[PDB]
Amino acid sequence: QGQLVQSGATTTKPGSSVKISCKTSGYRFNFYHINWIRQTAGRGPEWMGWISPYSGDKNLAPAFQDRVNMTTDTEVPVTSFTSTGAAYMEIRNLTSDDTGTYFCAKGLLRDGSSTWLPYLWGQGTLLT
Amino acid sequence: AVFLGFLGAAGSTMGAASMTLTVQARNLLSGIVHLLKLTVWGIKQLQARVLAVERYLRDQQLLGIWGCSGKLICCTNVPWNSSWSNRNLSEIWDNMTWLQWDKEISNYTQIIYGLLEESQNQQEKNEQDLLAL
Amino acid sequence: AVFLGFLGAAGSTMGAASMTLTVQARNLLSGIVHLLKLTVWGIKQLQARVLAVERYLRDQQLLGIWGCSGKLICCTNVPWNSSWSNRNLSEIWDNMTWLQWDKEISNYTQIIYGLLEESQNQQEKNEQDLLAL
Amino acid sequence: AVFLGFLGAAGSTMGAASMTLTVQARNLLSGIVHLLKLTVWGIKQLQARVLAVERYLRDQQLLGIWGCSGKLICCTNVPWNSSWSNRNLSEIWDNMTWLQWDKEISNYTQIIYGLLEESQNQQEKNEQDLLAL
Amino acid sequence: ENLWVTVYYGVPVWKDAETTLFCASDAKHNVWATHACVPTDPNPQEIHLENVTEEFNMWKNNMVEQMHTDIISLWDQSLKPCVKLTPLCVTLQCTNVTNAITDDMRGELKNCSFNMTTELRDKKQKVYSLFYRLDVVQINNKEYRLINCNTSAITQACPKVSFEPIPIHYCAPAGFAILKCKDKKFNGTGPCPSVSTVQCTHGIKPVVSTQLLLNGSLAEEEVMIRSENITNNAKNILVQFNTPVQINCTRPNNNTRKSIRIGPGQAFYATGDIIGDIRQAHCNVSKATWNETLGKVVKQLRKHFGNNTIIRFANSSGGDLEVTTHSFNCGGEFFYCNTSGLFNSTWISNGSNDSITLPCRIKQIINMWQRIGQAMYAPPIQGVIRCVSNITGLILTRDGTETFRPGGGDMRDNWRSELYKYKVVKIEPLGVAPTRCKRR
Amino acid sequence: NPQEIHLENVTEEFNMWKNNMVEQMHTDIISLWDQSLKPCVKLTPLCV
Ligand SMILES: *[C@@H]1O[C@H](CO)[C@@H](O[C@@H]2O[C@H](CO)[C@@H](O[C@@H]3O[C@H](CO[C@H]4O[C@H](CO)[C@@H](O)[C@H](O[C@H]5O[C@H](CO)[C@@H](O)[C@H](O)[C@@H]5O)[C@@H]4O)[C@@H](O)[C@H](O[C@H]4O[C@H](CO)[C@@H](O)[C@H](O)[C@@H]4O)[C@@H]3O)[C@H](O)[C@H]2NC(C)=O)[C@H](O)[C@H]1NC(C)=O
Ligand SMILES: *[C@@H]1O[C@H](CO)[C@@H](O[C@@H]2O[C@H](CO)[C@@H](O[C@@H]3O[C@H](CO[C@H]4O[C@H](CO)[C@@H](O)[C@H](O[C@H]5O[C@H](CO)[C@@H](O)[C@H](O)[C@@H]5O)[C@@H]4O)[C@@H](O)[C@H](O[C@H]4O[C@H](CO)[C@@H](O)[C@H](O)[C@@H]4O)[C@@H]3O)[C@H](O)[C@H]2NC(C)=O)[C@H](O)[C@H]1NC(C)=O
Ligand SMILES: *[C@@H]1O[C@H](CO)[C@@H](O[C@@H]2O[C@H](CO)[C@@H](O[C@@H]3O[C@H](CO[C@H]4O[C@H](CO)[C@@H](O)[C@H](O[C@H]5O[C@H](CO)[C@@H](O)[C@H](O)[C@@H]5O)[C@@H]4O)[C@@H](O)[C@H](O[C@H]4O[C@H](CO)[C@@H](O)[C@H](O)[C@@H]4O)[C@@H]3O)[C@H](O)[C@H]2NC(C)=O)[C@H](O)[C@H]1NC(C)=O
Ligand SMILES: *[C@@H]1O[C@H](CO)[C@@H](O[C@@H]2O[C@H](CO)[C@@H](O[C@@H]3O[C@H](CO)[C@@H](O)[C@H](O)[C@@H]3O)[C@H](O)[C@H]2NC(C)=O)[C@H](O)[C@H]1NC(C)=O
Ligand SMILES: *[C@@H]1O[C@H](CO)[C@@H](O[C@@H]2O[C@H](CO)[C@@H](O[C@@H]3O[C@H](CO)[C@@H](O)[C@H](O)[C@@H]3O)[C@H](O)[C@H]2NC(C)=O)[C@H](O)[C@H]1NC(C)=O
Ligand SMILES: COc1ccnc2[nH]cc(C(=O)C(=O)N3CCN(C(=O)c4ccccc4)C[C@H]3C)c12
Ligand SMILES: *[C@@H]1O[C@H](CO)[C@@H](O[C@@H]2O[C@H](CO)[C@@H](O)[C@H](O)[C@H]2NC(C)=O)[C@H](O)[C@H]1NC(C)=O
Ligand SMILES: *[C@@H]1O[C@H](CO)[C@@H](O[C@@H]2O[C@H](CO)[C@@H](O)[C@H](O)[C@H]2NC(C)=O)[C@H](O)[C@H]1NC(C)=O
Ligand SMILES: *[C@@H]1O[C@H](CO)[C@@H](O)[C@H](O)[C@H]1NC(C)=O
Ligand SMILES: *[C@@H]1O[C@H](CO)[C@@H](O)[C@H](O)[C@H]1NC(C)=O
Ligand SMILES: *[C@@H]1O[C@H](CO)[C@@H](O)[C@H](O)[C@H]1NC(C)=O
Ligand SMILES: *[C@@H]1O[C@H](CO)[C@@H](O)[C@H](O)[C@H]1NC(C)=O
Ligand SMILES: *[C@@H]1O[C@H](CO)[C@@H](O)[C@H](O)[C@H]1NC(C)=O
Ligand SMILES: *[C@@H]1O[C@H](CO)[C@@H](O)[C@H](O)[C@H]1NC(C)=O
Ligand SMILES: *[C@@H]1O[C@H](CO)[C@@H](O)[C@H](O)[C@H]1NC(C)=O
Ligand SMILES: *[C@@H]1O[C@H](CO)[C@@H](O)[C@H](O)[C@H]1NC(C)=O
Ligand SMILES: *[C@@H]1O[C@H](CO)[C@@H](O)[C@H](O)[C@H]1NC(C)=O
Ligand SMILES: *[C@@H]1O[C@H](CO)[C@@H](O)[C@H](O)[C@H]1NC(C)=O
Ligand SMILES: *[C@@H]1O[C@H](CO)[C@@H](O)[C@H](O)[C@H]1NC(C)=O
Ligand SMILES: *[C@@H]1O[C@H](CO)[C@@H](O)[C@H](O)[C@H]1NC(C)=O
Ligand SMILES: *[C@@H]1O[C@H](CO)[C@@H](O)[C@H](O)[C@H]1NC(C)=O
Ligand SMILES: *[C@@H]1O[C@H](CO)[C@@H](O)[C@H](O)[C@H]1NC(C)=O
Ligand SMILES: *[C@@H]1O[C@H](CO)[C@@H](O)[C@H](O)[C@H]1NC(C)=O
Ligand SMILES: *[C@@H]1O[C@H](CO)[C@@H](O)[C@H](O)[C@H]1NC(C)=O
User: Fold this and answer.
1) CATH code of the domain covering residue A33
2) HEC profile of chain E
3) Quick check: D12 contacting F, CB < 8 Å?
4) What GO MF annotations does this protein's record show (chain E) (predicted)?
């Protein structure tokens, strides 16, 4: 299983900075990364970055290197293998050319060569 | 290197815990469990001593009738009936922990123990026929 | 198929009972034999528990010093001295039961256990010399 | 031939005592050690019975995790670090007794038991990878 | 694709289990027989279980039910070879003993003379002993009898055994393991996020007290509150302090022990007399610290009853003497301290010098807690008595405006207060899983 | 047939004053007398 409910469909104007929420269920939130993906209209899909809900380590593309703040808060044990977590997304020098749908997706496996690969996605959020 | 300790990788992936099996193996008959006095503590310690050798010998007897005496990792000739688990190799050894694996494989663990048992008895029957020449 | 059960082929021929050895093997340390109370029944059950692991380990120790650890059917290098039994292969495995066989082979069973013992000790001495190069 | 008896070659050279290992092996679980009465003698005999199977299973567990199940003489892949003993082969097997050898090798016997342990766990990991094809 | 079963021995998977736990202890003889336990390793190995989250349920734990029967069996074992005081169940002629003190406090201890058997079966002797009032009853004249004579036999404790609790370590057999919930704000039930495994539990003193938990373990943050159904008023609330509120108790009367030969080999230890003054046994707890600590309990009680509600502390509402008082053992004597001065406080929705004193009485003939017919005579302790201990928890009770009053005469509530973080599991080292490996 | 095995070339240290066999036999014999007197008659009425 696994769910990743996302925040509302925010609507602001250039210069601002908005926060996107990703809330997880049905799986251990610490065991897999959290990826942030962007599907703009005037470009191909762009992988923004992933962050480690266990180690706190983060990794993002150079097109977002000093513009995005990725954060997660600690999970809440539900059962031995089920918890609830949350992941946050922010943009700095924000304009209106960054408009589109924003997705959150967790990693694929816990080890190997495709650990962080975005496997299970959220329903997305429309923006400005 | 790592060396997490006894049960140290119980939350790790099956492929990662499978490299540190000797860690759990040696702690199955030691602990701290000389005269035998039958005091309230003395009876308690005697039961703790008999119990450990009992549960240890049951597991070794299973490894024996499977042809896996003295092995921490032995391979078999029982093919994996996908109705036990249709999961793939990577989504097991690089994803699941032995605890959550044991949870979903628990129903068929008796079926598997019988196929391993008769695979070894038929195997030892073949090895005798091959050496009959 | 068949599956007669524990000791189910005790009256069958030696060749037929020899195919269902796992049936008797697994019932040598289980039965139904958690606090240790020393009541009249509690002492009785404790003796039943210690006794089973004792007689089980004696047989496994013999299989060990013979080079037959973990085997239900192992072959050896002790030739069959016909003064033990001058019967032929067919009139044994397709005629006698293990009970009546054990009856007439019982005198020399100690002689055989010594030859198996030193055959394994000399064999393990040779394997070391061969790996010395 | 010779046959000195149980511990009969304790004063002999390591190479000479090493040929009569079965002599000491079989006397590690027998002795003379049927109801369980808890008299002053009965408790004493029960402790003697549990103790023998305990110390016997500890040694067999070590032989297991080293890959030397059922062996009196097994060879390994742990090289001899000369800081354990810089003595030569002839001045050991044709000179020292196992007692005086155990006296000077006693400090590092724990170091050796760990290298043997992980050599077997890595060996069993390689054998699985080789049979994966 | 081509996948076969592969067997693994020594895999990290366990199951909840009940098993017999033996005792570890550190290097005369105490009732707890800790000399018979296996020596504790000076390096108590604790292994942290990263990524592991275990379920706990301190109210179904078998470790407490096992310790409960153990301690009762240890007292049973300790009293077996001692003296039967059945000849003491005889007609007593008693008078008040000295100190024409405050009205109706002279009867609190008595001077009793009686005819006793000797080393010769046919020759009596007239002897006397000092007895506390709580250990005798009238006949209706000044005649008395021991309190236990109509319900129980009585056995005096061998005076060489120490009543001083020694830390016990409970261990699991090989093939089993103890799991510890390292969650610093752990309720006692539910998924514990931080888990470690240990061969033996920490040192636990078998202290049996009432209302106030003595010499126990302290929480690291805040002050936890534990019941199985907190909405149920019939389940005792177990609070656990993080700061130790000290308490000083004393029996100031300088007693003397007089041995009395009641038979060949048998000697009854009587109370000779009192050297010096006849004072009152009591306990001190700093009024300042007890108010602060009684307030932290209020803050955490609010989370279960509302930031607006008013909660009140009242004294015990009846029951046996052991449960209506802070009963405990101090230097060998069994005190029974009135605690109305500790639970007489009403707190709203939102000293500093002296201390509060607790008048304690003393019994010698104490009855068995969950059994009848068995009673113990605690021999008299010579000299002046004073023990210093910390209150590290309580045993409260709700009535269903909230009102909380203490109690709890069930010994296994004491053991729950220390065994809440521990859990017994059995190792199952055999594991089968598919890989592309095949034999031969 | 009380089997005795001779240990040629062997030289062992002994110390009869630290031997535990005597301390074990000492407690055994005392326990045997204790065990033997348990079910017998108490003569406390004779103290007259
Ligand atoms: C408990 O559970 C957690 C959660 O599952 C486990 O954490 C995860 O462990 C797995 C494997 O142990 C990790 O997978 C690996 O991922 C790395 C990618 O990280 C590398 O790249 C980072 C970004 O570039 C970089 O910052 C890292 O470098 C250092 O910095 C961080 C800072 O915190 C430090 O923590 C690191 O340790 C580094 O020191 C890092 O290098 C990837 O490199 C791995 O692939 C290699 O190894 C695999 C074999 O494992 C091999 O197949 C590949 O070919 C390649 O060679 C591997 O994929 C995962 O990232 C962890 N975190 C998650 C999932 O969030 C934890 O291990 C568990 N512990 C226990 C005890 O159970
Ligand atoms: C208890 O003890 C008894 C007595 O010894 C055992 O009974 C004997 O078992 C052996 C082997 O199990 C039998 O030997 C076999 O004989 C058959 C011949 O019978 C066939 O031919 C019959 C006549 O043509 C025919 O009627 C049979 O067909 C069916 O009908 C009967 C009716 O009752 C039915 O009972 C049968 O079971 C059949 O269903 C029968 O087919 C012969 O075919 C066998 O040879 C084959 O197998 C051997 C290997 O075993 C192989 O080497 C050959 O090459 C060939 O392939 C075999 O010789 C014997 O006949 C039985 N009866 C006696 C001796 O009187 C019994 O098994 C013991 N049971 C236990 C549990 O110990
Ligand atoms: C206890 O401890 C003592 C002291 O160490 C041990 O005694 C020594 O044993 C070793 C090996 O067992 C001996 O080494 C051998 O030496 C012989 C040389 O002796 C031969 O030559 C003599 C002179 O020519 C001759 O008299 C002997 O012939 C008989 O006469 C004596 C009379 O007493 C009789 O006792 C003999 O037994 C003979 O019956 C004798 O033949 C040498 O031949 C040996 O070499 C052969 O064997 C080795 C293998 O062992 C092989 O490698 C060679 O190639 C060759 O084939 C061997 O070197 C030593 O001499 C003994 N005495 C000492 C050291 O003083 C005793 O064994 C220990 N016993 C136990 C139970 O521990
Ligand atoms: C408890 O009651 C007993 C009585 O059963 C008291 O014992 C008696 O105490 C008196 C007073 O001390 C003793 O008399 C004294 O005798 C001495 C010695 O001859 C003499 O010097 C004094 O002048 C006085 O007469 C008496 O002997 C004694 N009797 C017995 C049998 O002990 C006891 O004092 C009481 N104890 C307490 C603590 O109240
Ligand atoms: C709580 O724990 C403390 C200490 O762990 C206990 O204090 C101990 O009390 C006993 C008896 O009251 C003391 O023994 C006494 O020692 C003095 C001086 O050596 C001696 O004169 C007495 O005869 C007696 O042997 C012990 O020393 C003392 N320990 C410390 C460290 O002060 C206290 O009793 C415990 N509380 C409860 C309720 O058990
Ligand atoms: C009086 O008990 C006994 C008497 C005779 N035979 C027995 N066999 C087991 C007993 C129990 O162990 C027990 O019931 N006990 C009572 C509570 N208790 C205390 O220490 C205590 C007592 C009063 C006030 C405060 C604490 C532990 C123990 C002594 C027992
Ligand atoms: C309690 O009373 C006993 C005597 O009943 C006191 O013991 C005396 O102690 C002094 C120490 O200064 C000794 O010199 C005496 O020899 C002791 N007398 C006896 C009969 O033992 C003891 O000191 C008293 N305790 C207190 C605290 O006052
Ligand atoms: C209980 O008694 C102890 C000791 O008898 C008291 O602790 C002492 O406090 C003073 C404060 O001036 C210190 O100087 C001493 O060093 C302390 N002694 C010890 C052994 O710690 C404590 O204050 C008393 N508490 C109550 C409530 O009576
Ligand atoms: C992300 O936001 C948090 C808000 O608390 C802030 O503390 C943190 O510094 C930010 N990250 C970076 C890289 O500045
Ligand atoms: C799997 O097992 C079931 C019964 O458990 C059996 O009917 C089926 O044939 C098996 N499949 C394979 C491929 O072995
Ligand atoms: C990893 O294991 C969990 C256990 O339930 C499973 O739900 C999940 O799908 C697995 N991951 C993959 C990528 O299959
Ligand atoms: C195991 O059997 C139980 C029986 O109730 C069933 O509920 C469960 O789904 C089964 N699990 C698997 C993996 O077959
Ligand atoms: C058979 O054993 C006897 C002694 O039991 C022996 O004398 C004889 O040589 C042996 N025969 C063969 C062929 O091994
Ligand atoms: C076994 O020995 C006994 C001894 O009396 C003898 O009667 C019997 O014939 C012997 N049997 C065999 C098969 O040698
Ligand atoms: C021998 O062991 C020591 C440590 O005990 C180690 O430092 C050294 O490298 C080892 N030497 C060899 C040749 O393995
Ligand atoms: C073993 O250690 C002891 C420690 O005191 C030392 O005296 C002795 O020389 C050591 N022996 C060897 C062979 O290293
Ligand atoms: C003891 O003193 C109390 C209080 O003065 C009194 O009521 C009682 O009757 C006295 N008892 C005896 C036996 O003197
Ligand atoms: C002891 O017995 C006598 C009768 O011989 C009696 O007069 C006396 O009152 C008894 N003593 C006590 C203290 O009751
Ligand atoms: C024993 O006597 C006391 C006298 O106060 C009484 O309260 C109690 O009920 C009696 N016990 C029994 C079992 O009758
Ligand atoms: C104890 O705390 C846990 C924390 O998750 C909670 O789920 C549970 O309901 C609490 N139980 C009580 C009785 O308060
Ligand atoms: C707790 O008690 C209340 C009433 O006192 C009851 O309604 C509720 O069901 C109980 N909770 C549980 C978990 O039994
Ligand atoms: C109660 O008050 C505390 C502040 O002391 C606050 O943290 C908590 O959220 C409040 N809860 C409710 C239900 O009002
Ligand atoms: C509780 O306090 C009231 C107030 O006077 C008192 O009457 C009652 O005896 C007290 N109960 C206890 C057990 O101290
Ligand atoms: C406890 O003390 C209060 C006053 O401090 C008193 O009224 C009450 O009677 C006492 N309890 C008993 C049982 O004497």
Assistant:
1) 2.60.40.10
2) CCCEEEEEECCCCEEECCCCCEEEECCCEECCCHHHCEECCCCCCEEECCCCCEEEECCCCHHHHHHHHHHHHHHHHHHCCCEECHHHCCCEEEEECCCCCCCCCCCCEEEEEEEECCCCCCCCEEEEEEEEHHHEEECCCCEEEECCCCCCEEEECCCCEECCCCCEEEECCCCEEEEEECCCCCCCEEEECCEEEECECCCECCCCCCCEEECCCCCCCCCEEECCCCCCCCCCEEEEEEEEEEEEEEEEEEEEEEEEEEECCEEEEEEEEEECCCCCCEEEEEHHHHHHHHHHHHHHHHCCCCCCCCEEECCCCCCCCCCCCEEEEECCEEEEECCCCCCCEECCCCCCCCEEEEEEEEECEEECCCCCCEEEECCCCCEEEEEEEEEEEEEEEECCCEEEEECCCCHHHHHHHHHCCEEEEEECCEEEEEECCCCC
3) yes
4) identical protein binding; structural molecule activity
Interface check B88 vs A, CB under 8 A: no
Atom 2 of ligand 20: nearest residue by CA position: E187
Q: Which residues of E touch F47 (CB under 8 A)?
A: 119-121, 263-264
Q: Look at D57 and B25 and tell me if their CB atoms are within 8 Å.
A: no
- From the list A30, A54, A77, the residue facing E191 with the nearest CB is A77
Residue in the structure block whose two tokens are 């050898």: D101
Q: Which domain holds residue A67?
A: 1-128
Whole-number Å distance, alpha carbon C88 to ligand 13 midpoint, is 18
Looking at ligand 6, which residue's alpha carbon is closest to its atom 26? E328
Residue D110 to residues D18, D113, F48: CA-CA distances in angstroms? 22, 5, 69
- Please enumerate in sequence order all residues whose Cβ is within 8 A of that of D99, keeping only pairs 6 or more positions apart, or say none: D10, D11
User: To 10 degrees, what angle do helices D40-65 and B40-65 make?
Assistant: 40
Q: Which residue in B88, D69, B58, C69 sits closest to E430, CA to CA?
A: B58
| CA E131, chain centre distance (Å) | 25
Q: Which residues of B touch E12 (CB under 8 A)?
A: 7-10, 12, 17, 24, 97-99
Using the beta-carbon criterion (under 8 Å), do E435 and D128 form an inter-chain contact?
A: yes
Cβ(E272) to ligand 7 under 6 A? no
Cβ–Cβ gap B125/C19 under 8 Å: yes
Query: CA-CA distance, A7 to A22, in Å (whole number)?
Result: 7
Atom of ligand 11 nearest to the CA of A27: 7
Burial string for D67-106 (b: 16+ CB within 10 Å, else e) reads bbbbbbeeeeebeeeeeeeeeeeeeebeebbbeebeeeee
- Nearest alpha-carbon partner for E232 in E306, E304, E302, E314: E304
Considering only CA atoms, give the Rg of chain A: 14
Q: Longest C-alpha distance within chain F, in Å?
A: 67
Residue type at A33 in one-letter notation: H
E12 vs B10: CA distance, rounded Å: 5
This entry's atomic model was obtained through X-ray
Closest partner CB to E51 (pick from B12, B32, B113): B12
**Ligand 12 touching residue B107 (CB < 6 A):** yes
Name every chain C residue with its beta carbon within 8 A of the beta carbon of B63. 70
| Distance (Å, whole) CA E399 – CA E409 | 17
F21 in contact with E, Cβ within 8 Å: no
- Judged by CB atoms closer than 8 Å, whether chains meet at B117 and C22 is answered as yes
Q: Which of A93, A103, A120, A100 is nearest to A29 (CA)?
A: A120
DSSP letters, D30-62, are: -TT------SHHHHHHHHHHHHHHHHHHHHHHH
Residue E439's nearest CA partner among B74, F24, B60, B132 is B74
For chain F, say whether E86 makes contact (Cβ under 8 Å): no
d(CA E178, CA E44): 13
